[PDB]
Design a protein around this nucleic acid. Structure first.
Ligand SMILES: [Zn+2]
Lengths: 1012, 184, 147, 108, 187, 199
RNA sequence: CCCGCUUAAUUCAUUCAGAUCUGUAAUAGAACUGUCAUUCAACCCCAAAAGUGCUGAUAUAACCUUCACCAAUUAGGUUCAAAUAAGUGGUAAUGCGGGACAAAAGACUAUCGACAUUUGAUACACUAUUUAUCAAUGGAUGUCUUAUUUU
DNA sequence: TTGTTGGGGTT
């Protein structure tokens, strides 16, 4: 079948598009159109540019540009004037490449912005092409065609024609959406509980004021006649009266009440706030835990919500049975995770329309066209549901509770009462005002900073022993005319620092910033390790505590103003980039557009006016590709200037007057950079790279002074050091603690999670707590020091995993969303460390096994959310899949096709293109079989999946098994001809295939994998 | 395209390279052998050519050139500079697209120059390198100019209309005074 | 960079003086008290039956003080005619070869024939008078501009 | 190709020139073609009724005879819905006759 | 009676003025090259509705009047005004743009302009709008143009907006040029 | 009681065998209609001989469960309220419409009449449309808007055209219509006679 | 399992701010009023347009089996069908009443253009709609009999 | 009288 390739030429990918009828290199376009003859003479530069240029055209026009010999091709007009004439011919058409940063006036073009693709347009090669074509053919070649020119190794740059940005693009009733996320993060609390004093339940208080305050629901355009509106207003007045007779005190008291010892905790907190001296430690910890273990549970609050609705809304407003279905769905409305939401169709699809009482029909359209009546009363049931939810359920959950998620549990929800949260607020404003932050008045801040920069905001998330803060900056002041929040202001500086970050891996210390560089360092170290002969290895792990708040303005600004890796003047360019996604080349149905092969991305960059030998001045872009597959670039006219002076002012501001708000009390940080700024993640690594580099001269040479292989990686915090010489790791720990002693930071929980054993008294580190393990667990990793291979750590219980999957499904376009969803979960982590240099074959199989087992459990909630929607009553899927048992077959379809996609991706990520195709076929079938075996053995025991679907899935797995067997049986006869000379990797794969006896049965391989 | 040029803050580069120039000059010529200084002081001959540093490469737009009297015009927003250049070899180096006018170029390396005129010195400017980075054709109305070829008269014009240009005129006056104080 | 309204006699005189005194700076701009390349003129546009020119559609402009040879264009992908000549063909053909003056903006370049860009049909005598005055005025607006 | 110069003059210049090829531009007369200038009229060679319907105007280039008689070599008309001015046209003619502007209209 | 002026005089008297001045002149130029690359409309209410709340599904509701309204489409274009001397980049507002589209095609009403352009841009019929604009090139008029020296994003800028657009009368343009040139020869 | 427990066990073993529950089959329908053939304990509480041997609900529930826990065909575990046997033991007013646009389909006139709100039967043919009702009061119910005093015309709108209708049919035509109806009815009768006999 | 009917009681507490009152030694106590703001943290990385080799083998496999819900552990049958089983862990239950057509049937000249489907086409609808008409098609619906409260 | 979804890691 059509596997994937790791080297292509854009000629093919343009030939295999639909909307294009002609594509070729300009050399053949000239030979065909007879503008030149083969035996002509042109220097190698001009001939090469003629050779690798590409042109495309929607219609074959080799005839229109045939050379009529009537008029000589002798040119006198400059290239600027010919191109002026071209844009002039374009008239009023408004989207072309040569028409970037230029506006026409009458019969005169006017350039007014910077387009760094011109330097290829007004080149000397284009002057030669104008000499060859003559103007009357040029000024039309620059319109009828699409011109790409190879400017990088493979990445073409479009210079003329239409921009591909234009190949990448009756009304109905869209039901409203219930504002769930308004309930989450409140901090208000009044004397007598209830709902807010601005809500209409308490507006200055018959039906008159209800009309005055319900201007958005009473006179909506769904209510046909005045009678419907007035009856609804009557029901709203009845709702209000029936709600104002509730003893919220008692009502809360019954189901979800404060703990039995709440007064003890209030007293303890009041004591810890009164005392002037620095209070205890374990008392505060146990106070935090006793406060966080008082959170209401879903069932109790659900009973509360039912009991508060049953006596605030008349019965016949929804009907006898619709009301009950509503009250039953309300529970699932409560227990949903943070990033989910419930749709009005979920409520409606299980309701009856005639069941309500107060309807009225103008033209008696109920019996003739019943379907129109059903639709035009669903469009009222929906509004009533949304009114009830967004005007009782949401304000109650806002005022009367506090809703958050804990730190380590994941993405679940959590309901704490209100006074308990005011308590934790006071206790944290006390525990906080002593470590880093400090209260501040308004005049302690200057006025320029006051009128230029935005304020801050702080949120608290409960953790196990203590709290955890998180700073938000999204606000922008309404007055003083500021239109940008802090990150929108620092984006330019962050671009400068990105261009700097592209160099810290080898220049001024020890850092990494992604999985590509980490995998690179691993490739190099593992190469050295297999070189010397694979000895015993040791490691060590440790991590700074509160890094972003231990760094001082002085050394930061001093390193910044005294480092030459930041030039003085920088320009900024914006462009669009088009790459090749994973879809294989569809071998040639009649609708194959660009988005089927190319991903669009809208990038920026910051280049230097110097003659840096990367010449971002001539190309316009700087990109890093992983393999030779073509890509396109087009520039844009939106450049800007930036200078180290303004970056200095920015750093000084964000490191001096960082003012953040909390509970209408203004705080100011004392030393450190705020956590939660786009610039911070690079500043921190830069600063600590300075220090760690000045302290670790012994690393650079210890490979040649005594010959000991050893690497040191370091993300923002979590160090990691692997070596063969124990003494190196020991001295490293000592030197790092020395740097911490001298410069003023300290390590978190002293968790020097080393591998060996050593007396920690000989080095004044006795307070450290060694924790000896045998599998180096870095940031979500399982580096195994027996083969030095990598993999990931996966949660292993269905609840553990369920707490981190937010399902959000809508019947609109299932086959798309779900598809990508599952696909994403297969590549979210496997794509990175599947590199074949790190792992052996069996390691690859193990990684695939484990990650498939994890992604099945991550997906499963999606399947059980699907099976709760009936795919019979919808034509879109029933017309194609059938009318009975449509669900299981739809599911079988998406599973099989996503497995084929992921199998292709893995099959090419493991090999080059030079290998035989029978090996790629075998391993194709093997990965597909492993994934299907996992999915079957996990699915053969569920309830909804046991009767029908298991037959199909079993058949599919048996098919894949037989196909594997067929391939591995045929390959030996294929090699019997000697017709292929086996290279090294191929021989290794063949030994992997024969040793494990893939001919008869896969049994020999599962023991070799399933053990974790 | 006003902001991209304006935010260069060229006056900083000019002030810093002039400080470098005066410092290097009255640091290199403190012999004060008054006879040798009298032999050095000759009319209309170059005494000192200070090539600016590397980080001071401002980029601006040509509004008008004259080739025989070696006059080039530059501008950025509100200020328009009148400068000189080495020779036509320069323009042959900076690969212009259509015409010397209406083009926006960066400046790889320029230089200050010290001349002796009637009764006093002269601080001249000479652009030694250029490269055209783009075309732009816009009718910029720079309210104020400054000439680096007409002495204190070339700068003191319009000095009362900008704190920046006022302080630059002040630095220029101080520089010529320190020059005539050292060497005379 | 700027247009100048002047009559065919002035065009002939300028092209004569320039093509007979080639010792000017090699700027394709002509020189009449400055650099110009576009012009405006009102005159009697009539066709001229040339010999089988598919790329070009030549014309002619007679006026009170001379006669020049203008040149037009045509879409190459399909040799139809633009609006500004479609309308003139329609109206001239209807009213029976009864020609009218036209107000035309045209782009003149040396070492090639004088392109024409656009024209509109005039239906009022005062136009000429206006145009006349215009030239006169603009004349001074360059003469005193050079002194 | 070939320069057929046909200047613009006034009606007194019609007698002042005493034989020359010129252009005269005015309005037609209602009653062998005769046209009004300014009052006063003048006869021509073209047929009174040959001219088209919608037109109310006239311009002719041709040789002028003694007076009240002019030869017509070329004739052009158009539909003017406005009262054609004469004072400003007279000013343009006179200032064309001037010395400071002579180099604009004709050579020499 | 009025006093007219050319383009270059306006450009001068506007590029040499203090920030905040607003003043109008009268020119005999001509419009050209109506821009199309930016958005061609904005939304308004009858009583100077500041903002009409944006919904999808084509629903709308106002707060400067406290009723449910059909939102109104005001269209503002960008074009250039020329003369025998110079070029001015001008903006054009609802009434004047409607007047233009009416003068080119009398089919559309005084209130149907914005409706027509919105329907043509949404339905997928822009070629008719494109040619409708293109047939406005070099339409001679008589302009009353306002200039104002404001400042935006804490940097100085200059803008020109259109106030009046009438049809011309050559009999007055000629008299204007006549008095101009007579005064000129008079010195 | 333990004696009561043995008595209940014996009585339930007697009343749980399908041998008696087939020729009697009083509760057999309930047992088959049960959730999993596992009827609750209160299903025996509707009896008679248990109450006289009895002399709360959960108390008697636990008592019956204890008495059943010793059975051999029944089953009791996990305090299940239901208990089941572990053996299967299987085995005069109508009008006419005219002036109709010739070529009018059925649904249009059907709904143009159905707008009235009450059922009817219509038979259309080219022009002539016989409409009949089911209740005798329907005439004067609907007359005020079929005899539209707004127009005083018996008008029905269909597909863009007005057609007339009658207020009362001559009773000779009505008799012919009733014979038509009884004729269709005997048609159906004889149709199904032949179908009963064709085999 | 399905269906109908049915769920109460003074406050567990009262941040922040203001104004009072009583006493007070710098604390305490009592009564009262006002009250969400633009609600969404950022960075790095990865994916992101409208088709099966419809699927022949590895009994050393695949299925099936148990009284609330679901999930993780034991035993017995089974060779493309089905058979009754045993532990453990986590979610879930106030009470009242109701549950012999049960099918191989015959008889019903009982009902029936207003029966009842199942296919088509036409209409109004659609984001997961419970319809109308016509056409063809023939059976459809309720009772008695193989029937006795220890039900 | 203008300028749309929610994975993985780190804090
Ligand atoms: Zn309003």
């Amino acid at each position: 079948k059509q596997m994937l390739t790791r080297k292509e030429d854009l000629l093919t990918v343009l030939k295999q598009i639909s909307a294009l009828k002609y594509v070729s290199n300009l050399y053949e376009f000239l030979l065909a159109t007879e503008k030149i003859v083969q035996t002509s003479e042109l220097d190698t530069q001009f001939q090469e540019f003629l050779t690798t240029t590409i042109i495309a055209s929607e219609q074959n026009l080799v005839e229109n540009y045939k050379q009529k010999y009537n008029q000589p091709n002798f040119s006198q007009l400059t290239i600027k004037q010919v191109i002026d004439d071209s844009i002039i011919l374009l008239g009023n058409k408004q989207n072309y490449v040569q028409q970037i940063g230029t506006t026409t006036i009458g019969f005169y073009v006017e350039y007014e912005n910077i387009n760094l693709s011109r330097q290829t347009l007004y080149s000397s090669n284009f002057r030669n092409l104008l000499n060859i074509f003559g103007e009357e053919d040029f000024k039309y070649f620059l319109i009828d065609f699409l011109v790409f020119t190879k400017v990088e190794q493979n990445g073409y740059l479009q210079v003329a024609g239409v921009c591909l940005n234009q190949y990448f693009s009756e009304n109905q009733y869209i039901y409203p959406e219930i504002q769930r996320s308004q309930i989450f993060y409140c901090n208000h609390m009044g004397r007598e509980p209830g709902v807010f004093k601005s809500s209409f339940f308490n507006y200055s208080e018959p039906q008159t004021i209800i009309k005055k305050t319900l201007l958005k629901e009473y006179q909506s355009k769904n209510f046909s006649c005045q009678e419907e509106r007035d009856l609804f207003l009557e029901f709203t007045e009845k709702i209000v009266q029936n709600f104002h007779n509730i003893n919220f005190n008692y009502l809360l008291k019954k189901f979800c009440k404060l703990p039995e010892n709440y007064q003890s905790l209030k007293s303890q907190v009041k004591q810890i706030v009164q005392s002037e001296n620095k209070a205890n430690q374990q008392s505060c910890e146990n106070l935090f835990n006793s406060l966080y273990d008082t959170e209401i549970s879903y069932k109790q609050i659900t009973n509360f919500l039912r009991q508060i609705i049953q006596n605030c809304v008349p019965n016949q407003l929804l009907g006898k049975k619709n009301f009950k279905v509503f009250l039953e769905k309300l529970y699932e409305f409560v227990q949903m995770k943070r990033f989910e939401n419930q749709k009005v169709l979920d409520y409606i699809c299980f309701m009856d329309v005639f069941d309500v009482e107060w309807f009225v029909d103008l033209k008696n359209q109920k019996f003739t066209q019943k379907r129109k009546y059903i639709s035009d009363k669903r469009k009222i049931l929906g509004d009533l549901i949304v009114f009830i939810i967004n005007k009782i359920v949401i304000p109650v959950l806002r005022y009367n509770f506090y809703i958050t998620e804990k730190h380590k549990e994941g993405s679940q929800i959590f309901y704490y009462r209100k006074p308990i949260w005011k308590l934790v607020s006071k206790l944290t404003i006390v525990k906080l005002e002593e470590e880093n932050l400090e209260k501040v008045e308004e005049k302690l801040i200057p006025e320029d900073s006051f009128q230029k920069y935005p304020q801050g905001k702080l949120r608290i998330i409960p953790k196990k022993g203590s709290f955890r803060p998180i700073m938000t900056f999204l606000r922008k002041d309404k007055q003083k005319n500021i239109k940008l929040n802090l990150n929108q202001i620092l984006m330019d500086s962050q671009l400068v620092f990105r261009n700097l970050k592209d160099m810290l891996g080898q220049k001024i210390g020890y850092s990494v910033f992604d999985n590509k560089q980490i995998s690179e360092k691993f490739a190099q170290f593992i190469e050295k390790w297999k070189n010397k002969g694979r000895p015993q290895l040791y490691y060590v792990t440790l991590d700074i505590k509160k890094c972003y708040d231990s760094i001082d303005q002085m050394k930061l600004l001093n390193f910044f103003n005294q480092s030459d890796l930041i030039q003085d003047t920088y320009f900024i360019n914006k462009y669009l980039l088009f790459q090749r996604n994973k879809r294989p080349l569809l071998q040639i149905m009649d609708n194959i557009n660009f988005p089927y092969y190319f991903n669009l991305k809208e990038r920026q960059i910051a280049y230097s006016l110097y003659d840096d030998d990367d010449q971002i001045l001539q190309k316009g872009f700087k990109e890093i590709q992983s393999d030779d597959r073509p890509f396109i670039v087009i520039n844009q006219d939106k450049p800007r200037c930036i200078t180290k002076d303004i970056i200095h002012n920015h750093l000084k501001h964000i490191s001096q007057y960082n003012v953040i708000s909390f509970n209408k009390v203004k705080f100011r940080q004392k030393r450190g950079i705020p956590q939660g700024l786009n610039i911070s993640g690079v500043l921190c690594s830069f600063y600590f790279g300075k220090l760690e580099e000045e302290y670790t001269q012994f690393l650079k040479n210890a490979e040649q002074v005594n010959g000991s292989i050893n690497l040191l990686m370091r993300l923002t915090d979590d160090y990691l050091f692997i070596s063969d010489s124990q003494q190196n790791a020991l001295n490293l720990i000592v030197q790092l603690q020395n740097c911490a002693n001298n410069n003023g930071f300290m390590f978190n929980d002293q968790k020097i999670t080393t591998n060996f054993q050593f007396p920690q008294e000989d080095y004044n580190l006795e307070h450290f707590k060694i924790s000896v393990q045998n599998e180096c667990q870095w940031i979500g990793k399982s580096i195994d020091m027996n083969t030095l291979e990598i993999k990931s750590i996966q949660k292993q219980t269905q609840q553990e995993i369920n707490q981190t999957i937010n399902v959000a499904i809508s019947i609109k376009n299932l086959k798309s969303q779900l598809k990508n969803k599952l696909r994403s979960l297969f590549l979210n982590q496997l794509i990175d460390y599947f590199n074949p240099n790190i792992n052996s074959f069996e390691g690859l199989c193990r990684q695939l096994y484990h990650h498939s087992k994890a992604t099945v459990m991550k997906f499963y909630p999606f399947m059980t959310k699907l099976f709760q929607i009936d795919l019979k009553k919808s034509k879109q899927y029933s017309v194609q899949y059938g009318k009975e048992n449509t669900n299981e077959n739809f599911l079988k379809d998406i599973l099989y096709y996503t497995v084929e996609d992921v199998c292709k991706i893995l099959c090419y990520l493991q090999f080059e293109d030079e290998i035989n195709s029978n090996i790629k076929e075998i391993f194709k079938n093997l990965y597909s079989w492993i994934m299907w075996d996992i999915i079957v053995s996990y699915l053969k025991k569920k309830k909804q999946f046991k009767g029908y679907l298991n037959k199909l899935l079993q058949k599919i797995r048996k098919s894949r098994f037989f196909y594997l067997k067929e391939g591995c049986k045929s390959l030996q006869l294929i090699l019997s001809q000697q017709k292929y000379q086996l290279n090294k990797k191929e021989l290794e794969a063949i030994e992997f295939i024969d040793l494990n006896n893939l001919i008869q049965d896969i049994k020999t391989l599962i023991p070799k994998i399933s053990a974790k | 395209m006003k902001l991209l040029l304006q935010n260069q803050n060229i006056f900083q580069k000019l002030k810093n390279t002039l400080n470098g120039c005066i410092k290097k000059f009255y640091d290199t010529y403190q012999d004060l052998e008054q006879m040798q200084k009298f032999e050095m002081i000759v009319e209309d001959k170059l005494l000192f050519r200070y090539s600016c540093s590397q980080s001071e490469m401002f980029s601006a737009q040509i509004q008008a050139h004259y080739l025989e009297k070696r006059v080039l015009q530059l501008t950025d927003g509100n200020v328009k500079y009148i400068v000189n250049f080495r020779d036509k070899g320069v323009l042959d180096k900076a690969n212009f697209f259509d015409t010397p006018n209406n083009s926006l170029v960066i400046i790889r390396q320029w230089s200050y120059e010290i001349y002796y005129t009637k009764n006093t010195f002269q601080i001249n400017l000479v652009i030694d390198e250029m490269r055209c980075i783009d075309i732009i054709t816009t009718i910029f109305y720079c309210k104020l100019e400054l000439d680096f070829t007409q002495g204190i008269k070339g700068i003191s014009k319009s000095s009362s209309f900008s704190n920046q240009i006022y302080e630059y005129s002040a630095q220029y006056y101080k520089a010529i005074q320190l020059l005539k104080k050292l060497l005379i | 960079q700027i247009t100048v309204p002047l009559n065919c006699f002035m065009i002939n005189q300028i092209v004569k003086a320039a093509k007979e005194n080639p010792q000017a700076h090699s700027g394709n701009h002509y020189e009449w008290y400055g650099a110009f390349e576009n012009a405006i003129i009102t005159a009697k546009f009539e066709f001229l039956q040339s010999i089988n020119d598919s790329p070009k559609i030549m014309g002619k402009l007679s006026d009170s003080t001379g006669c020049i040879e203008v040149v037009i264009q045509k879409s190459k992908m399909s040799d139809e005619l633009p609006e500004f000549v479609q309308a003139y063909e329609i109206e001239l053909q209807n009213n029976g070869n009864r020609h009218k003056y036209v107000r035309a903006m045209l782009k003149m370049r040396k070492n090639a024939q004088i392109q024409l860009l656009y024209f509109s049909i005039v239906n009022d005598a005062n136009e000429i008078s206006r145009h006349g005055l215009d030239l006169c005025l603009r004349y001074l607006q360059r003469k005193h501009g050079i002194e | 190709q070939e320069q057929v110069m046909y200047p613009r003059i006034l009606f007194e210049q019609m007698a002042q020139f005493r034989g020359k090829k010129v252009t005269v531009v005015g309005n037609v007369c209602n009653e062998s073609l005769v046209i009004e200038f300014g009052q006063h009229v003048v006869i021509d060679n073209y047929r009174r009724v040959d001219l088209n319907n919608t037109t109310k105007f006239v311009e002719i280039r041709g040789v002028v005879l003694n007076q009240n008689i002019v030869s017509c070599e070329e004739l052009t008309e158009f539909e003017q819905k406005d009262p054609f001015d004469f004072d400003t046209y007279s000013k343009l003619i006179h200032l064309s006759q001037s010395d400071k502007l002579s180099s604009l209209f004709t050579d020499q | 009676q009025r006093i007219y002026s050319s383009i270059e005089e306006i450009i001068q008297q506007a590029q040499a003025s203090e920030i905040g001045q607003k003043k109008e002149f009268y020119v005999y130029g001509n419009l050209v090259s109506i821009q199309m690359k930016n958005k061609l409309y904005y939304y308004r209410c009858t009583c100077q509705g500041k903002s009409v709340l944006k919904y999808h599904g084509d629903s709308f509701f106002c707060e400067s009047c406290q009723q449910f309204i059909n939102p109104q489409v005001h269209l503002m274009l960008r074009a250039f005004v020329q003369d025998s001397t110079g070029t001015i980049p001008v903006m054009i507002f609802d009434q004047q743009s409607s007047q233009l589209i009416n003068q080119i095609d009398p089919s559309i009403h005084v209130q149907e302009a914005g409706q027509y352009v919105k329907n043509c841009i949404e339905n997928g019929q822009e070629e008719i709008i494109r040619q409708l604009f293109s047939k406005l090139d070099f339409a001679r008029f008589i302009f009353e143009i306002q200039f104002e020296n404001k400042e935006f994003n804490n940097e100085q800028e200059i803008a020109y907006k259109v106030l009046k657009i009438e049809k011309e009368n050559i009999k007055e343009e000629s008299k204007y040029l006549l008095k101009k040139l007579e005064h000129l020869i008079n010195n | 009681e333990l004696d009561i427990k043995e008595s209940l066990k014996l009585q339930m073993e007697y009343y749980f065998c399908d041998t008696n529950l087939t020729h009697d089959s009083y509760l057999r329908g309930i047992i088959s209609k049960s959730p999993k053939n596992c009827v609750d304990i209160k299903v025996f509480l509707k009896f008679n001989k248990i109450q006289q041997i009895l002399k709360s609900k959960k108390d008697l529930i636990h008592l019956i469960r204890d008495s059943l826990k010793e059975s051999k065909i029944l089953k009791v575990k996990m305090d299940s309220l239901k208990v089941k046997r572990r053996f299967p033991f299987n085995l005069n007013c109508l009008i006419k419409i005219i002036n109709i646009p010739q070529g009018t389909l059925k649904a249009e006139v059907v709904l143009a009449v159905r707008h009235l709100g009450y059922e009817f039967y219509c038979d259309y043919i080219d022009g002539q449309a016989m409409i009949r009702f089911q209740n005798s009061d329907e005439q004067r119910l609907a007359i005020q808007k079929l005899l539209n005093h707004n127009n005083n015309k018996l008008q029905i709108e269909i597909r863009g055209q007005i057609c007339d209708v009658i207020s009362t049919i001559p009773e000779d035509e009505e008799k012919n219509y009733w014979n038509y109806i009884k004729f269709k009815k005997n048609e159906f009768r004889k149709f199904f006679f032949m179908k009963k006999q064709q085999k």
